[PDB]
Amino acid sequence: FNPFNVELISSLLESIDFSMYIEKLPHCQLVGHVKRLHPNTHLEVHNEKFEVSKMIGKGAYGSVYVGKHLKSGKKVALKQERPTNYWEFYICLEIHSRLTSEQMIPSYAHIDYALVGNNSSVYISEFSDYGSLIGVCNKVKSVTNRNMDEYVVMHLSCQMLDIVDHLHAMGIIHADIKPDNFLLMKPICADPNEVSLQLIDFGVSIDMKLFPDNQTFNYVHHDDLFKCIEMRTGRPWTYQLDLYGLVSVMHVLLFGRYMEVVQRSPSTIWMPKTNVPRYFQRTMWENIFRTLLNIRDCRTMPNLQQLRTQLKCALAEKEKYVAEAISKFNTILQ
Numbered sequence: 552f553n554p555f556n557v558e559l560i561s562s563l564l565e566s567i568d569f570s571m572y573i574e575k576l577p578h579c580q581l582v583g584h585v586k587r588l589h590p591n592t593h594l595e596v597h598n599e600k601f602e603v604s605k606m607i608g609k610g611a612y613g614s615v616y617v618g619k620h621l622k623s624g625k626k627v628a629l630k631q632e633r634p635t636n637y638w639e640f641y642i643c644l645e646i647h648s649r650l651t652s653e654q655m656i657p658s659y660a661h662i663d664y665a666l667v668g669n670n671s672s673v674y675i676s677e678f679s680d681y682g683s684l685i686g687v688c689n690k691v692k693s694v695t696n697r698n699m700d701e702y703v704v705m706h707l708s709c710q711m712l713d714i715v716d717h718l719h720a721m722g723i724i725h726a727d728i729k730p731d732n733f734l735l736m737k738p739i740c741a742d743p744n745e746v747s748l749q750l751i752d753f754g755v756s757i758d759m760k761l762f763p764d765n766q767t768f769n770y771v772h773h774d775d776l777f778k779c780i781e782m783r784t785g786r787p788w789t790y791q792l793d794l795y796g797l798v799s800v801m802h803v804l805l806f807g808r809y810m811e812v813v814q815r816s817p818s819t820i821w822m823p824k825t826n827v828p829r830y831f832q833r834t835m836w837e838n839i840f841r842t843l844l845n846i847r848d849c850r851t852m853p854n855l856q857q858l859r860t861q862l863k864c865a866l867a868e869k870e871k872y873v874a875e876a877i878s879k880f881n882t883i884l885q
């Protein structure tokens with residue numbers, strides 16, 4: 552079974568009359584034809600006018616632009632895709648309908664306005680001036696000529712675990728967890744519980760509530776970098792795919808490079824090829840990586856809040872240093 556299959560997705564959306572639903576939403580405008588985003592222009596959704604300012608990313612099938620809602624003055628991202636990405640809108644709508652935690656609402660992208668054409672969609676959401684973890688990590692490294700501080704990465708990992716934990720509680724698999732798809736929305740606070748990250752880009756997410764309970768998947772990514780452990784050993788997967796992605800992000804944050812996994816021969820345990828330095832909190836990181844990468848089956852996922860506890864205990868041992876590191880981090884990014 553392949554949960555990313557384009558015809559499956561069409562079938563799923565039709566089965567729940569998605570089109571009929573979004574036609575009723577006041578922040579969504581259906582139109583015949585959506586123009587290509589272009590710098591220094593204006594865009595309207597109903598009554599609301601937006602400046603379209605500068606390109607952020609641009610591929611053959613879409614782009615992201617920064618712009619501004621003229622009335623409120625708020626900066627926005629404008630995300631355009633061909634063909635129309637209904638599925639991305641569906642996941643975003645479901646996430647915010649299933650949320651009950653006041654704490655977690657800022658940590659998932661919210662589509663404020665949607666312009667939905669026959670050819671193309673444009674989704675508008677809050678713009679982050681700090682950008683993705685990729686941009687933040689590269690900025691910090693270029694200024695310091697060092698890897699991101701170990702304890703700042705603990706603080707960020709604690710946050711990512713919390714966001715993924717609540718997402719999985721809602722029966723959603725993001726399925727594209729990478730540093731590119733976490734935004735830093737605001738500076739870091741000393742309190743590890745304060746969320747400053749936001750998960751974005753639900754383009755290939757999986758909604759488990761659309762499938763029977765006990766449903767699993769066996770589709771295998773082509774690119775080795777993105778194969779989770781189950782995909783490498785001919786086994787079924789569900790939430791494991793996101794947990795694999797979490798490790799890959801932590802790896803990029805800690806080491807400035809992309810994760811390769813290997814069996815730690817002669818055992819069957821999978822771990823990153825990179826060795827955690829002995830003067831890092833090595834036992835802690837190894838526990839975290841091992842627990843997230845090596846999962847018995849789809850019936851029971853590891854306790855993510857236990858991992859957060861391990862990180863908070865390490866952060867608590869050095870509260871003075873941590874406050875200092877976060878301050879330097881925030882100052883770099885001002």
Ligand SMILES: Nc1ncnc2c1ncn2[C@@H]1O[C@H](COP(=O)(O)OP(=O)(O)O)[C@@H](O)[C@H]1O
Pocket residue numbers: 607608615627628630676677678679680682683731732734751752754
């Ligand atoms: N709301 C936003 N604020 C700031 N930057 C953003 C925002 N949305 C997207 N970006 C930038 O654009 C990149 C691509 O956006 P994303 O929604 O992930 O598109 P794609 O589906 O093409 O990966 C992000 O990794 C980020 O660097």
Ligand SMILES: [Mg+2]
Pocket residue numbers: 731732752
């Ligand atoms: Mg993305």
Ligand SMILES: [Mg+2]
Pocket residue numbers: 727752753754755
């Ligand atoms: Mg995407």
